[PDB]
């Protein structure tokens, strides 16, 4: 339902970078209230940047350059009304749409509820393998936990419907195996930027959920 969860703050930024090489046709930001779509911004290379009147003095684009590959949505002064699920939708030829869904919630630092269960370190330049140490498990999620946001790196599932494509910009290798096994996440050619908290979330059919948190350190 969402690819990234960000913590509500005054000048929060909803990160969205197009990761494909296709030339953009149009980019749009929208927000789902409960079931309806408010248009926030629309950019097309044949026109000027269009921001709806309801958001003209509420959001702006800080980390963009020509072409607008980075369409991150920064807020001037974000309020309770900005809580919800946002949609960053890139359109291109001939690939079509590339969508990223960002859920804005009210919370404290996400690292508080994610204490480290293991300390893994590795030298820069190696393929780090994060093995998750977690009948009737249904869904498995790999995510990187930061104080301001949580990014889903991998979402595996056996029975139900999902071939989840990670919208995380950094390249990671996931395995959605069928023998219920040690869920691993591979960080190819890990650098110092890949350091942080990586959480393995297993969700069973009972509603039970268990978390295993690995703190990765790349000196």
């Amino acid at each position: 339902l969402w690819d990234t969860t960000v913590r509500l703050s005054e000048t929060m930024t909803l990160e969205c970078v197009y990761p494909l090489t296709h030339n953009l046709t149009q980019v749009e930001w929208t927000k789902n209230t409960g079931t309806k779509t408010v248009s926030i911004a629309v950019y097309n290379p044949n026109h000027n940047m269009h921001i709806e009147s309801n958001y003209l003095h509420r959001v702006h684009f800080l980390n963009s350059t020509v072409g607008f590959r980075n369409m991150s949505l920064s807020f001037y002064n974000a309020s309770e009304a900005d809580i919800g699920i946002y949609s960053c939708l890139f359109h291109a030829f001939p690939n079509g749409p590339w969508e990223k869904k960002i859920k804005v919630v009210w919370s404290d630092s996400f690292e508080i509820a994610a204490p480290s269960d293991s300390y893994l370190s590795a030298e820069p330049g190696q393929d780090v393998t994060l093995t998750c140490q977690l009948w009737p498990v249904q869904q498995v999620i790999w995510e990187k936990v930061q104080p301001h946001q949580v990014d889903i790196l991998a979402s595996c599932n056996l029975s139900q419907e999902t071939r989840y494509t990670s919208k995380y910009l950094r390249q990671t290798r996931s395995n959605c195996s069928q023998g219920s096994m040690k869920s691993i996440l591979i960080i190819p050619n890990a650098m110092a930027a890949d350091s942080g908290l990586y959480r393995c979330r297993s969700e069973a059919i009972t509603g039970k959920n268990k978390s295993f948190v690995i703190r990765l350190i790349i000196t």
Partner: protein, 118 residues
């Protein structure tokens, strides 16, 4: 506002060719610019058919799909797509999407139903 018009269901027989109609309704006084049309199968990774205002058509497999009403040098308003040689795996829901400015994207879902023989 700009609204996509399409039926909820399109029936077709096994082995026949069927056309999924999908049109963009825009009021006579409202200005809009449609950049490209996109068909996607509900439950897949990417799109199966795209028509760009300048680049023309593109299909996941060119032999099975065809934009029957989209044409270069004309207003992109009709995204109707014909599917050739219906097989049982073509059964499902399909998304017809219009990329418009400045209104944004408008989409609708169409249930393609493949019928068996007598």
């Amino acid at each position: 506002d700009v609204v996509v018009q399409a039926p909820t269901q399109v029936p077709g027989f096994l082995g026949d060719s069927v056309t999924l109609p999908c049109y963009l309704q825009v009021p006579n006084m409202e200005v809009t610019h449609v950049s490209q049309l996109t068909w996607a199968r509900h439950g897949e990774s990417g799109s199966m058919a795209v028509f760009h205002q300048t680049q023309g058509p593109s299909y996941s497999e060119s032999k099975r799909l065809e934009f029957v009403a989209a044409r270069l040098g004309a207003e992109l308003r009709n995204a109707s797509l014909r599917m050739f040689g219906l097989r049982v795996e073509d059964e499902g829901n399909y998304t017809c999407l219009f990329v418009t400015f400045p209104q944004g994207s408008r989409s609708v879902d169409i249930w393609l139903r493949v019928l068996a023989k007598p």
